[PDB]
Amino acid sequence: ALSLTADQMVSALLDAEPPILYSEYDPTRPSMMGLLTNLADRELVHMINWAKRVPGFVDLTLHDQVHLLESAWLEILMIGLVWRSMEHPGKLLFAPNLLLDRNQGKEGMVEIFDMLLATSSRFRMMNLQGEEFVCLKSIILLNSGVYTFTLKSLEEKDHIHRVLDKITDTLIHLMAKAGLTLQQQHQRLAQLLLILSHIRHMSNKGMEHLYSMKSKNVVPSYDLLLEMLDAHRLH
Amino acid sequence: SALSLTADQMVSALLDAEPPILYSEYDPTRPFSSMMGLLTNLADRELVHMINWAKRVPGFVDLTLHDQVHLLESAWLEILMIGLVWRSMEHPGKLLFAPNLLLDRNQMVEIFDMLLATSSRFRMMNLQGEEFVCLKSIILLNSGVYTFLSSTLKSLEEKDHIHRVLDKITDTLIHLMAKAGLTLQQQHQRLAQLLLILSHIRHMSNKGMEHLYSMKSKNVVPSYDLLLEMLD
Ligand SMILES: C[C@H]1CCN(CCOc2ccc([C@@H]3c4ccc(O)cc4CC[C@@H]3c3ccccc3)cc2)C1
Ligand SMILES: C[C@H]1CCN(CCOc2ccc([C@@H]3c4ccc(O)cc4CC[C@@H]3c3ccccc3)cc2)C1
């Protein structure tokens, strides 16, 4: 799977995109963290399906797949949200039936809303494309946990870096395909990758909130993630 | 005007701007135990030199003093950390906080382990000094740029300048790799590998800031006014 062309990498990633879920609230009746949590919990299931279709990810051990998802899942929900929200200045499209502005985020929620809104606006300014977005989301999946991991290990990390390298090649191909000069290409690569630092930052701040709730299962456990990932072949 | 430096001149400027390597102040003839005290004293002295360094990052002092403070308030711990990871590079398994304070993980350990992993990543990539100073400057310019939370005309001008300087550092990084003979493909791949490590350095800073805030001591986190005073 390290033998896909750049164009096939793109097709594969676009094909793998999760569905856009709806919030579950009675639209005929007049809670917020409740809605957001229910949404995130349903997305996680589809996120696992998506991860398994990221070329190269299922070549890893089960344990390493879990570790990467444990590190990246909130960043992945967040970049998804920021992407969806790109065409709604000043609002966050949590779901097509749950479009919130910052005053609807108002304890310690408006702080993270604002960061998400800033990132969406940055995406809008850069005119981020769908093909670029799916590359970036895959990069988060592969990179966020890689510094936190034996001979098999070295083989695992080497493979992860090879896949990351091929996504870089793909991003560059997309930019060359759109007519950017070599200078513009490396400049845009750099701009896009630096935004991943801010997405990390946001995830840390959000994780900080979810832990402060002290509810038994508000961070996906290793064993929960393993259960979702450790699929069987009887379907 | 420093948007008109050559890449070589950018590198020369950054290398010359490098802060000194400070020493820990413990009495070496006395015994050992303390640790957070030593680490804090070191960081507090480094911060002053950090401000001097920042003012020499081409393009930084063209910003308003308010924006200079905002960038440094965002980035200061990331900058201390990338500095640490860099001078620790040739000490596998240890962190060279200062030449007289080289610590292993047994001597927080959550944070030590992340820093040690980054040092090893730098070692694995054979990070060069010229690359290091570009990355450190990128942290300074990038870390706070999405939290300005103001869109006055001046702020728009500020963000544009920050991104033009960041673009120039990118050009400089690519120029360094071209000069070492890397192919175009290798150049782009290495640029990406280096920038993705910045995400981990952000992560570490957040984990570290969580620690310093949990201490509940009056000024462990540098206040806006303190940075303002140092940058005046
Ligand atoms: C992995 C699941 C198992 C237990 N679940 C706990 C609920 O965690 C979350 C995660 C994200 C969110 C909010 C959200 C919901 C859907 C989405 O597509 C993106 C986001 C972005 C973050 C957002 C949030 C996170 C933390 C505090 C406030 C808001 C809220 C609660 C997470
Ligand atoms: C801005 C200064 C004013 C008040 N100071 C509070 C002390 O903050 C720190 C910052 C970093 C450190 C440790 C350190 C010291 C020197 C250095 O060159 C790099 C580092 C990397 C982080 C390290 C640390 C940070 C947080 C918890 C444990 C260890 C310890 C205390 C910070």
Residue numbers in the entry:
A (entry chain B): 307 to 336, 341 to 416, 419 to 461, 465 to 550
B (entry chain A): 306 to 338, 341 to 414, 421 to 545
Sentences from the study reporting this entry:
The pro-oncogenic cellular activities of estrogen receptor alpha (ERα) drive breast cancer pathogenesis. Ligand-dependent transcriptional activities depend on the association of coactivator proteins with ERα to form functional complexes. SERMs and SERDs elicit a structural rearrangement of the ERα LBD to sterically preclude binding of coactivators in the activating function-2 cleft. Activating somatic mutations near ERα helix 12, Y537S and D538G, enable hormone therapy resistance in metastatic ER +breast cancers.
We also solved structures with the WT LBD for those molecules with no existing structures (LA-Deg, LA-Stab, RU39411) or were able to solve to improved resolution (RAL). LA-3 possesses a 3 R methylpyrrolidine (similar to OP1074) and showed a SERD-like profile with an IC50 of 26.94 ± 0.4 nM and maximum normalized fluorescence of 0.48 ± 0.07 at 5 μM. LA3-2 and LA5-2 are subsequently referred to as LA-Deg and LA-Stab for Laso degrader and stabilizer respectively. We discovered that addition of a 3R-methyl group on Laso’s pyrrolidine induced both ERα SUMOylation and degrading activities, while addition of a 2S-methyl on the pyrrolidine leads to an accumulation of ERα in the breast cancer cells. LA-Deg induces SUMOylation but to a lesser maximum than fulvestrant and GDC0927 in WT and is further reduced in Y537S, while LA-Stab did not induce SUMOylation with either receptor. LA-Deg showed a slightly increase induction compared to ICI and Veh, but it was significantly lower than Laso. Despite their unique influences on WT ERα cellular stability, the methylated Laso derivatives showed identical transcriptional antagonistic efficacies in the WT and mutant cell lines compared to unmodified Laso in our assay. Overall, these structures present canonical ERα LBD homodimers with 2–4 monomers in the asymmetric unit.
